[PDB]
Amino acid sequence: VRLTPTMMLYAGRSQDGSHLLKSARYLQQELPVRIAHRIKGFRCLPFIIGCNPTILHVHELYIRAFQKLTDFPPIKDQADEAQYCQLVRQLLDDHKDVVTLLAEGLRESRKHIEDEKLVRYFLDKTLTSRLGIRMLATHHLALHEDKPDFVGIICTRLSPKKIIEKWVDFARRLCEHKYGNAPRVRINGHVAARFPFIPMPLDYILPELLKNAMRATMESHLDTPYNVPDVVITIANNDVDLIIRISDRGGGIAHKDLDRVMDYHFFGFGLPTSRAYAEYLGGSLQLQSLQGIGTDVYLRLRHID
Numbered sequence: 001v002r003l004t005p006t007m008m009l010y011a012g013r014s015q016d017g018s019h020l021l022k023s024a025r026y027l028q029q030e031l032p033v034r035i036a037h038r039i040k041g042f043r044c045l046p047f048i049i050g051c052n053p054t055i056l057h058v059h060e061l062y063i064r065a066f067q068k069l070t071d072f073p074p075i076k077d078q079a080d081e082a083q084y085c086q087l088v089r090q091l092l093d094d095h096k097d098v099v100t101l102l103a104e105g106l107r108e109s110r111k112h113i114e115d116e117k118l119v120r121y122f123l124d125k126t127l128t129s130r131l132g133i134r135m136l137a138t139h140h141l142a143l144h145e146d147k148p149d150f151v152g153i154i155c156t157r158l159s160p161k162k163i164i165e166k167w168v169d170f171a172r173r174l175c176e177h178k179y180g181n182a183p184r185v186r187i188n189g190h191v192a193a194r195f196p197f198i199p200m201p202l203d204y205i206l207p208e209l210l211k212n213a214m215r216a217t218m219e220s221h222l223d224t225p226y227n228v229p230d231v232v233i234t235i236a237n238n239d240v241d242l243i244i245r246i247s248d249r250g251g252g253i254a255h256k257d258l259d260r261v262m263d264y265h266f267f268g269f270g271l272p273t274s275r276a277y278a279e280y281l282g283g284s285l286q287l288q289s290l291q292g293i294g295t296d297v298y299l300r301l302r303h304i305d
């Protein structure tokens with residue numbers, strides 16, 4: 001069994017599938033507790049915010065999810081567990097545009113936001129809660145799968161070089177469509193590291209950070225779009241954490257914008273959600289700006305037990 005903040009992803013196996021029931025019964029009682037905490041966060045929002053028709057709609061979705069989940073009887077066998085997976089899959093679908101509806105509701109409410117820390121902490125708690133819930137749910141759904149090098153959602157031999165390469169090719173495509181070119185990426189450091197890790201957090205953070213590094217490079221080289229400097233990624237693997245540094249030669253975040261980059265913009269969500277995700281899983285996301293030259297972004301993530 002693996003662990004992250006206060007959650008457990010069961011790594012045990014059984015011939016008779018009894019491991020699926022131990023995991024499903026844990027999931028069955030954890031999800032309503034996690035969803036009730038989000039309802040409490042919605043009830044504690046300032047009145048003027050919480051009664052915004054869009055924010056109110058998202059609040060209602062959370063009440064419907066807790067209702068559908070608590071109205072599901074306790075899981076007695078494989079047949080019960082199978083139907084519980086259908087409910088979980090329906091909730092993941094009904095809450096797909098929750099972040100889109102949140103930023104859209106909070107944008108209208110911007111005329112009443114005297115303190116930006118309120119919106120940051122509400123979005124940090126809401127976005128990390130869905131990460132924890134999606135990880136918990138998709139791990140269980142993946143315990144039925146017979147994937148190679150995966151115990152549920154935990155990759156038994158994850159290669160940080162390989163996962164970075166997958167998202168570099170993705171970001172270079174978006175970059176190439178927008179600007180006609182994309183900076184090449186050079187990966188150095190512990191390029192041969194292989195270890196147990198959950199890819200899902202990296203699968204959100206990496207494409208966002210890579211998009212930012214490539215956008216910055218392109219925006220600071222309008223003169224020569226066909227010839228832009230490389231983005232350098234350095235991998236540092238050790239017993240405590242995995243460090244992935246992303247360096248760009250994109251001019252750097254200006255002194256007057258240094259605070260604004262880590263806040264939610266109404267959408268500029270990549271950097272603040274990535275930092276919330278990193279902190280939620282025991283890590284960090286730090287920025288080092290060399291104004292006039294570029295930015296160095298340090299992503300640290302704690303290893304699995």
Ligand SMILES: CCCC1=Nc2nc(NCc3ccc(Cl)cc3)nn2C(=O)C1
Nearest residue numbers: 171174175178207211212214215216218
């Ligand atoms: C297949 C998933 C569809 C997706 N389409 C997307 N379009 C963008 N445009 C923002 C952007 C483009 C280029 C640079 Cl350089 C920076 C930012 N992002 N994006 C996704 O993340 C996923």
